[PDB]
Structure 1
Amino acid sequence: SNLTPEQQRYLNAKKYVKLFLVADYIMYLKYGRNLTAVRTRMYDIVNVITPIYHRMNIHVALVGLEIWSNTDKIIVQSSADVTLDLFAKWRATDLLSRKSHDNAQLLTGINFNGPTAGLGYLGGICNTMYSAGIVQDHSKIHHLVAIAMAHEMGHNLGMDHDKDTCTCGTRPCVMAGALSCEASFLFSDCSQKDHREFLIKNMPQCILKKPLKTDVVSPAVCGNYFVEVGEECDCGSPRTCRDPCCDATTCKLRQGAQCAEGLCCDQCRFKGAGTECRAAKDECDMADVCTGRSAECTDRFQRNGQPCKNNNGYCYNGKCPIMADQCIALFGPGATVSQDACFQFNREGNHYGYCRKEQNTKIACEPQDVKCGRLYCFPNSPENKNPCNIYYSPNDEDKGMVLPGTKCADRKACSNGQCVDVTTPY
């Protein structure tokens, strides 16, 4: 109704925050130079964060853990602001290059100036440079440090501080503005809305990808609604378990059953081979089918080259990359594709107008490949007086270039800066 079938579908999807935790040098000393103790402290903290976020339809999964026992990798300091900035930066150039994860939190033993015990970018979830938070190991009671960490992840997820009239009960909520040991594990009604709205407007993609059981480095917990190595199923505690196929007490399948949760499981048995589990969502998707022996249902799409969106594009890995949609994504609503003559600028091989790079040398487009180099857009309005406009980033010169798989002519799409036949496998 108010939400597109895309938004609606995104909201109903199960969310997962693949968390990476870091403990600083002071944490290592604080716990007696006992990596076993530091690690344990971190597990206990995640064991508290997880149930807190389950009430927000998000499963927090520790997919990575690092302890700077040898020395800090960033300049951890009294200023929370500077530390956050340095941690996020380090996360972007160092950590994200060797370990994929949706969010990172720094647990430090230092004392931040002021009464705050943490800091996090508001709405930075999934962002390559802002999905981060830092937390002070401010109390001996670990469930209070977990709440502080949950609070920062709260901001990361688009939530603000609870204001005078927000409530979750008789006690303070996770997003309360200040500390207290009366802190509960519940989110206020306001946080619920903020978060929901944030998702509606931003739909961060990374939290839809479920972590592999083998990617979780935290000791398995039976009853946390996530199947971890050593478990066959997990429907929660024996009191909340609604899955007849699973014995919530042992996290083992109940005699007979072959599976429990999933699109390819019926009455505790593998759906029939060739049975449809997930229908196609769009003209570039292909109905998914069960294999009979598996419990999960692999997702497959149409073969690249399938005409889509009223002969305006060709399917590419599940999507329908169109030049009109790209212009809108770069310059906002109203943006239209520039007239053909504008693309001639790509034959220049100049600083912005080219088709590809050999290594660092920009190679001008061929007369026939003009539509596969730099994208030229025109914000359609009475004002603007320039038919040709480009989007450029000094950080990544590839940004603003026509996307691969984009229709560049009849029966042709861009491959590697070249307009080629969609009938040839790509």
Structure 2
Amino acid sequence: FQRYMEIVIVVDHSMVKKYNGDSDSIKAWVYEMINTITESYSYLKIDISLSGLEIWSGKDLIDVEASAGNTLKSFGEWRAKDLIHRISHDNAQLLTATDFDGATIGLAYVASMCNPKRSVGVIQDHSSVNRLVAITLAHEMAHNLGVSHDEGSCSCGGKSCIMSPSISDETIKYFSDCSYIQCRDYIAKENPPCILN
């Protein structure tokens, strides 16, 4: 049974600076990522719809911190207080050029699909290869859908897939059988209504 996920991508001010204010360049970068993950999600029978793309060109609407956990929390709260009343969507992801403390390049709440303040994730625009960033984006969204990291013999043809605990050159842009299983059982068990439409 097909599920539909209406998402909004939010681009922060550090990203706008990183791209020298070129809003079109920013749109092309984000669009290519969406193109990539739309395919990956189709194989889990989840249709991705880009409901909106918000760019914080004037200034950030939250304080994006080096602390990934602080930023994630602030982002969800801002989403619930502001964003959901302007655009109807099921999930929102923040794209930032900020380098978070430690090895962290993305963070997200687990099993929180449809929660006003928790159906969110944060991702660092960590690579010049669009594919690597798209994978991180897919990864955090997957955490919202209750999927955990791959391990052992989980595979997607090869063994290094989207839910790999490490992002690299050899990561395959597809979800493993493990991710498929976990994702579908979460939907089956929790059946979040917002992705039913």
TM-score (norm 2): 0.97
1:367-382 alignment runs, 5 A limit: none
Q: Give 1:170 deviation, angstroms.
A: 2.1
Q: Distance in 2 between matches of 1:115 and 1:108?
A: 15
Q: Deviations over 1:176-211 (max 9, x none)?
A: 1111121111111111111121112100111111xx
8 Å Cα contact 2:8-2:52 kept in structure 1 = yes
User: 2:116 — aligned with what?
Assistant: 128
User: 2:88 — aligned with what?
Assistant: 100
Letter matched to residue 110 of structure 1: T
Q: Please give the secondary structure, in 2, of the residue aligned with 1:92.
A: helix
Q: Give 1:171 deviation, angstroms.
A: 4.3
8 Å Cα contact 2:44-2:184 kept in structure 1 = no
Q: Give 1:169 deviation, angstroms.
A: 2.2
Q: Distance in 2 between matches of 1:88 and 1:81?
A: 11
Q: Deviations over 1:27-70 (max 9, x none)?
A: 10111111111111111111111111010101111111111011
1:186 to 2:184 alignment: no
1:18 to 2:34 alignment: no
8 Å Cα contact 1:121-1:130 kept in structure 2 = yes
1:321-336 alignment runs, 5 A limit: none
Letter matched to residue 6 of structure 2: K
8 Å Cα contact 2:131-2:173 kept in structure 1 = no
Letter matched to residue 106 of structure 1: L
Equivalent residue pairs, number:
197
Structure 1 segments (4+ residues) deviating >3 Å:
none
Q: Which has the higher contact order (CA 8 A, sep 6+)?
A: 2
1:121-160 alignment runs, 5 A limit: 121-160=109-148
Letter matched to residue 3 of structure 2: K
Letter matched to residue 200 of structure 1: A
Letter matched to residue 124 of structure 1: S
1:222-301 alignment runs, 5 A limit: none
User: 1:289 — aligned with what?
Assistant: none
Letter matched to residue 40 of structure 1: A
Q: Give 1:165 deviation, angstroms.
A: 2.8
Q: Give 1:139 deviation, angstroms.
A: 0.1
Q: Deviations over 1:337-393 (max 9, x none)?
A: xxxxxxxxxxxxxxxxxxxxxxxxxxxxxxxxxxxxxxxxxxxxxxxxxxxxxxxxx
Q: Deviations over 1:259-295 (max 9, x none)?
A: xxxxxxxxxxxxxxxxxxxxxxxxxxxxxxxxxxxxx
User: 2:163 — aligned with what?
Assistant: 175
The structure with the greater share of residues assigned to helix is: 2
8 Å Cα contact 1:171-1:182 kept in structure 2 = no
Q: Distance in 2 between matches of 1:121 and 1:30?
A: 27
8 Å Cα contact 2:132-2:167 kept in structure 1 = no
1:200 to 2:195 alignment: no
1:82 to 2:75 alignment: no
Q: Aligned residues: percent identity?
A: 45
Structure 2 residue runs without a partner (length 5+): none
Q: Please give the secondary structure, in 2, of the residue aligned with 1:73.
A: coil
Q: Please give the secondary structure, in 1, of the residue aligned with 2:175.
A: coil
Q: Distance in 1 between matches of 2:110 and 2:4?
A: 18
Q: Please give the secondary structure, in 2, of the residue aligned with 1:63.
A: strand
Letter matched to residue 195 of structure 1: C
Q: Give 1:115 deviation, angstroms.
A: 1.3
8 Å Cα contact 2:158-2:172 kept in structure 1 = no
Letter matched to residue 36 of structure 2: V
8 Å Cα contact 2:153-2:159 kept in structure 1 = no
Q: Deviations over 1:292-327 (max 9, x none)?
A: xxxxxxxxxxxxxxxxxxxxxxxxxxxxxxxxxxxx
User: 1:33 — aligned with what?
Assistant: 21
User: 1:68 — aligned with what?
Assistant: 56
Q: Please give the secondary structure, in 1, of the residue aligned with 2:63.
A: coil
Q: Distance in 2 between matches of 1:116 and 1:150?
A: 15
Letter matched to residue 158 of structure 1: G
Q: Distance in 1 between matches of 2:179 and 2:158?
A: 16
Q: Distance in 2 between matches of 1:85 and 1:130?
A: 8
Q: Distance in 2 between matches of 1:45 and 1:165?
A: 27
TM-score (norm 1): 0.45
8 Å Cα contact 2:33-2:133 kept in structure 1 = yes
Q: Distance in 1 between matches of 2:24 and 2:12?
A: 14
User: 1:55 — aligned with what?
Assistant: 43
Structure 1 residue runs without a partner (length 5+): 1-11, 210-426
Q: Please give the secondary structure, in 2, of the residue aligned with 1:21.
A: strand
